[PDB]
Design an enzyme around this catalytic site. Sequence first.
Site, PDB file in Angstrom:
ATOM      1  N   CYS A 148     -11.504 -21.093 -26.653  1.00 26.30           N
ATOM      2  CA  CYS A 148     -12.426 -20.123 -26.089  1.00 26.30           C
ATOM      3  C   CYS A 148     -13.517 -19.792 -27.111  1.00 26.30           C
ATOM      4  O   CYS A 148     -14.334 -20.673 -27.424  1.00 26.30           O
ATOM      5  CB  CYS A 148     -11.700 -18.922 -25.503  1.00 26.30           C
ATOM      6  SG  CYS A 148     -10.491 -19.422 -24.252  1.00 26.30           S
TER       7      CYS A 148
ATOM      8  N   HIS B 275      -7.070 -20.909 -22.545  1.00 25.27           N
ATOM      9  CA  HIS B 275      -6.102 -20.415 -23.495  1.00 25.27           C
ATOM     10  C   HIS B 275      -4.770 -21.092 -23.219  1.00 25.27           C
ATOM     11  O   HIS B 275      -3.947 -20.570 -22.460  1.00 25.27           O
ATOM     12  CB  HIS B 275      -5.919 -18.930 -23.197  1.00 25.27           C
ATOM     13  CG  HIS B 275      -7.044 -18.102 -23.629  1.00 25.27           C
ATOM     14  ND1 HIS B 275      -7.045 -17.672 -24.938  1.00 25.27           N
ATOM     15  CD2 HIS B 275      -8.147 -17.546 -23.029  1.00 25.27           C
ATOM     16  CE1 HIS B 275      -8.101 -16.854 -25.137  1.00 25.27           C
ATOM     17  NE2 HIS B 275      -8.787 -16.771 -24.017  1.00 25.27           N
TER      18      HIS B 275
ATOM     19  N   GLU C 230      -2.340 -20.785 -25.070  1.00 31.63           N
ATOM     20  CA  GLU C 230      -1.425 -19.801 -25.657  1.00 31.63           C
ATOM     21  C   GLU C 230      -1.208 -18.597 -24.753  1.00 31.63           C
ATOM     22  O   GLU C 230      -0.280 -17.801 -25.003  1.00 31.63           O
ATOM     23  CB  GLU C 230      -1.834 -19.318 -27.039  1.00 31.63           C
ATOM     24  CG  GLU C 230      -2.924 -18.269 -27.095  1.00 31.63           C
ATOM     25  CD  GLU C 230      -4.357 -18.689 -26.678  1.00 31.63           C
ATOM     26  OE1 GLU C 230      -4.573 -19.847 -26.211  1.00 31.63           O
ATOM     27  OE2 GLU C 230      -5.284 -17.807 -26.782  1.00 31.63           O
TER      28      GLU C 230
END
Lengths: 244, 247
Positions: A97, A189, A191
């Site tokens: 990002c 993302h 994560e």
Amino acid sequence: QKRYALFLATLDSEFVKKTYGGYHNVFVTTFGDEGEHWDSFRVVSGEFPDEKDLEKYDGFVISGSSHDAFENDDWILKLCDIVKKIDEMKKKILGICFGHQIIARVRGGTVGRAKKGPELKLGDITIVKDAITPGSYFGNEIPDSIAIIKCHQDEVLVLPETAKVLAYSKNYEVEMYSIEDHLFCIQGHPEYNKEILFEIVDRVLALGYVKQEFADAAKATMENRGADRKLWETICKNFLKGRV
Amino acid sequence: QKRYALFLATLDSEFVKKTYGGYHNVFVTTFGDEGEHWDSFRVVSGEFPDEKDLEKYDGFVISGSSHDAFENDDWILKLCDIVKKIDEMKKKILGICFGHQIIARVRGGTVGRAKKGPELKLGDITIVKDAITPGSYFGNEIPDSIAIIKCHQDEVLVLPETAKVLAYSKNYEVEMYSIEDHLFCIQGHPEYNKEILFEIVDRVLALGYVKQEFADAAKATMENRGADRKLWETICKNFLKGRVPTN
């Protein structure tokens, strides 16, 4: 002995602090394997490694941020100079990002608010299969598309000349890209998870920054399906740890 | 029977909806007097008055926003077009925060991220007293400075060529400004209070967007004092309703 630096361009949220103990752990869960040392640097609060220590890292990860990668705050300019230095060393950097956009800015691209509005959701990105080798970071079978929790406040409006596009979507031509062999960038993302997303949506709804309908649509994207988390781990680790 | 149009460039927050019923009420409580008709348009959601209806308003107020006034979303471009028409009609517009920035953009200024960083706090603005007539919007006795709850994400980085500066702060030359006799612009929220501010700070804190200490510093600015709320009401109503001579 393997060492990885994480540049945390966001503070820990209340939800992430309480549920996971912070973004350090979130990143290390996602991209870490047993036996490695992970140092994080809260670059958003102006904490960075020394120049002279960069050589000991086997790679770097740059997180997401609530800041925009086009801003000129002191810590962003310092992060741009650090990234330039790392890039000149040909060290591996994975940008997520904000991090994707920072690498782009350092390589002469232009970042700004997304033409096609913000995104806060699970979406899908189309792989440019022509641009990927069987047996490389992407595995043997290369899928047509991959599901990822998207970060589309901003985007890369003009792509650096040296970048190769690895995936796109209908509303954005730069979902994923690489530069040479050592820079690898994703506008979503890996994560994140549904719990992290749902918490952000509810909070930005309560603030009045999005319509209830947009929030409901955002969450609806993860009611019955999640991101391709295992595949992203595999791709990201293969790139960052030179695993081909 | 006086009519005023409110352009809400922001959605209603949870706190504001449950405490006051929404930003229409907060704006009307602040700037309205009994016997007036206020219509509000949710411009952020692309809701606007018909062009042919501009002429029946005695004035207009443009709210703040979480969006940036340098952005190019369709509703922003359409707001800029409508503000241009109203300006050309010489109707009164009071611009607050994003609204101040939008008027500056329409009059050829530049808006962008605040040079000296964000602000979310009670602050003070120094009045350019030479730029003000005794007996106009600020009263007979012009104050040296006024306290206001600040909006300093963005700022007017290049002033319109026709802007008259009315107030400044150490870090920003453009806290308040007029253009001719029909445009009046404040980089601060008269319509906010302590509760609204603290709710915003808590929520942006929980999201991870500011440090605990920045939040604590913000809140500390309002522990023992508030904004000059009655003075802001007199100033803004004096301008928007033509209650005193123009400055």
